[model samples]
Target: PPEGGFGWVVVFAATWCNGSIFGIHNSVGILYSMLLVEFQAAWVGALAMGMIFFCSPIVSIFTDRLGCRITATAGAAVAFIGLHTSSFTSSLSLRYFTYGILFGCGCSFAFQPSLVILGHYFQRRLGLANGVVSAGSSIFSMSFPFLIRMLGDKIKLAQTFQVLSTFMFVLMLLSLTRIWAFGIAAAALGYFVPYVHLMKYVEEEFSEIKETWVLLVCIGATSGLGRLVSGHISDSIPGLKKIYLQVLSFLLLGLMSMMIPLCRDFGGLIVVCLFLGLCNGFFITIMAPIAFELVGPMQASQAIGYLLGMMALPMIAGPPIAGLLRNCFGDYHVAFYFAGVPPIIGAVILFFVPS
Candidate 1:
């Protein structure tokens, strides 16, 4: 299909789809709370996200076979049902199914089509298109975290789940529509550490709501800028290997993950988080264009889906271990400090990968 026209509308619609799916994921870190050990709490969001990754292979088929509109439409419905059911469940234990498994599977089903559909619409402009699409999550994430915090104070926990479902249910209207390699693939162990755990760290380090959401928002805001800038760079700059930019992002992102614990003041953390957000932007936005390059258009969906499936283990494995480290040391220092190791290693592999 030709570029521009309706493709731009699809870009924004997919942006909203991305925002709602991951925006919820980012916000859940706060309520992704209480229940069992802090580690178990990590499991809910972790499991949901893990399923989001793990089940990608299956959803890839849905999009490839059934069509983006139908696939994403079903996903939105599943997400709506899952999120709503999670609200009425008796305990956190039950959430593993509703919030974790069902909700996650729902996300998996819903999210795959957004990225793949862009490929059908844009060619040389795919980089810019996907960049805009990926930023949706970060922009909404900037707001959702704080919004959830405020809602938590004003309403009961279950009420908050209902609120979340109401927000997620909007996906039903947005029904729609990757890359691979261990370099980016393996970085999951470290990449998600901040997203999953940073809010709690901020809270304990400072005090209750001492601009708690501000730290996360910093990442989200710049991350949106990061995606736009990276999207533009990937498209505008000719001859640069998108993988090189991806490598830089991971290297910088890994470095930033380790630096989180080194900060003695809030200002230092913000500076680091801002850069981290940019790096994250680069890492995320470059994936689609790079995958298109590697798989050559049509296979792009499976290429990305398999990559995500490979990461499910690392994604699920990271935060629990990070939480356990917190339990063992009674601080997040070691957890945050060590989070960089895998990403750094993954970056090396990515760098070694020939474009």
Candidate 2:
């Protein structure tokens, strides 16, 4: 178990890089929403996010072949270009094609490559290492909105995007030169990454429809904070290595009752929404570190990516299945419960991962 070697340093760098990318990814949603409103195109809005939700796994396969540094650096540069160009566009078509597709691809690249780098970095306490690194993403998710709301207001969207680009370029370069792995385990987590996306879930679930956006944002905000808190707790608490299994046990039992009735209409929905956010914030952020712990740091990135890929079936299937349940049963209970079932399955399978 090599401890201090260059691996430790890579963990810090990867953490920073991952956090920034995820932060930007989270913040950009508001911008995309604005674009959709301005253009009056619903399809483009969904496409913009669908880019991140669906395309990441596709991009990851190629990323594996190209090498982490090359793919990641290229992705970061391209994403910066897309973001910068997005602000200058007055034409709807340009914004839709460029910002939606290009930025999504870039984000996808930066995310997976960095994960690959982390896999190359550590061999011991890999879970703790990945958790610390992922905590950066949790922090960034909370920070990015503040940056966009304040800075995008003061400097204008174009200037803000430019600033973001400059920082991204420097960060991408730092990562490209520093990482040492050919494949990343946790890389594929980016594929189903959007599943844990709080906003998307609410929109897909409830049919009240009008205030859905506001409600989703409120839920996401709460969940994002939950992630930060959970990261701190996970970091502070010792013996998670032995106790992660117990957490899994509870998660499994909880999954069985994922559809419990809440405060009637508003109360029930609100409670479920908040709980979903909390679970999402906790697990998505922690999954990579958990994989790293089981497999060791060397395989951490690759392991995450592969496991995410393997797990992608459930994540991808969850929303649509939920949709069908809602349509069929005229209630979201079954679908909601079904979504939680994956973690139950995931935890069970994780027991087999070599320690």
Candidate 3:
């Protein structure tokens, strides 16, 4: 038998599929802004677009229990319908809710569960495999914007989404044809996850300060690359267990958060932000495969579901609580404390889980 199975092939296909999905969906932010002119209000257009987050738990639950291919297929179908209808839509509400929500749901389906699959297929080289898989999303990040700009320039903006939807459906069907439709479904409703919380903590800590976006951008970009680098090392080195790497990452994350408040100027803040982003991205990106290692390939879906779903709690709790902590204490140090908790907690979890 070939060392690689249809399962590994499925993982590769998933990366491509989800990468395309992210490209289309991530391109929507610009689209949403354009739609605002016709909708007559930017805030409403943005709100309608933001409703996609509302469906996260619902989709996560169904996918975690029923399996990703099914949910993903369903999402593709919804996107097909939504995009096709988007061209005919004149009502602001319909475009925002139906097109936005449906398209957003499709993108979400392509994201989390795909990572869960990494746990199933690659044991020894999981870090590299996941990094490569996640990198597909990055490729999409680069390509989707260009595609949107080109298509929108040639056609009316309404027609652009319609074309994108059709393209997405065709690609989804082609890619997922041989994939299995059996895995666990996640059911963590209205809960906050650690990564989201960490993001919020940083924002809260720095919101009043100048150049929050610059800092946030620095954090996101650096972390994305960190995920890529860490994945390569984890996959190539035989003796280096994923958790051992994660523990080191956690140590770095905690240190960065602790040090952010010490910065007094833009230069110092830039250094601290880069460090924080590196830790945040490293921990968030690597955790799935690490968790998969602990749980085994068969139950990787279930493990990812439980881990991320449970994370939603801390995700929700973190920002508001950090805000409250700041309100009470009159400083962001307490907020940074909460920011340091994820890697610490993830480290502890990794500590207990068998390598």
lDDT of each: 0.71, 0.56, 0.56
Residue 255 CA displacement from its true place in model 1, Å: 3.9
The sequence of per-residue lDDT tens digits that candidate 2 reaches over residues 270-309 is 6655655555555566665555545665555555565555
**lDDT of candidate 3?**
0.56
Whole-model lDDT, candidate 2?
0.56
List TM-score per model, in order.
0.80, 0.64, 0.66
Query: Candidate 2: how large is its RMSD?
Result: 7.3
Candidate RMSDs in Å, in order, are 4.2, 7.3, 7.2
Clashes of each: 2, 14, 15
Q: Which stretch of 10 consecutive residues in model 1 shows the poorest summed lDDT? A: 174-183
Ranking by lDDT: 1, 2, 3
Please provide, for model 1 over 1-355, each residue's C-alpha lDDT reduced to its tens digit, 9 standing for 90 to 100. 7775766778778877877778777656655654216576655666666778888999999889988898888888887887667655467567667777778788898877877767766877777776777677666656666666676577766766767777666677756432236666677667777765455656676664446456555456777777888988888755536677867777777677666545446877767766866777777668768777777768988988987788778767766676677667657675357667776776664444465
Q: How close is candidate 1 to the true structure, as a TM-score?
A: 0.80
Clashes counted in candidate 3 amount to: 15
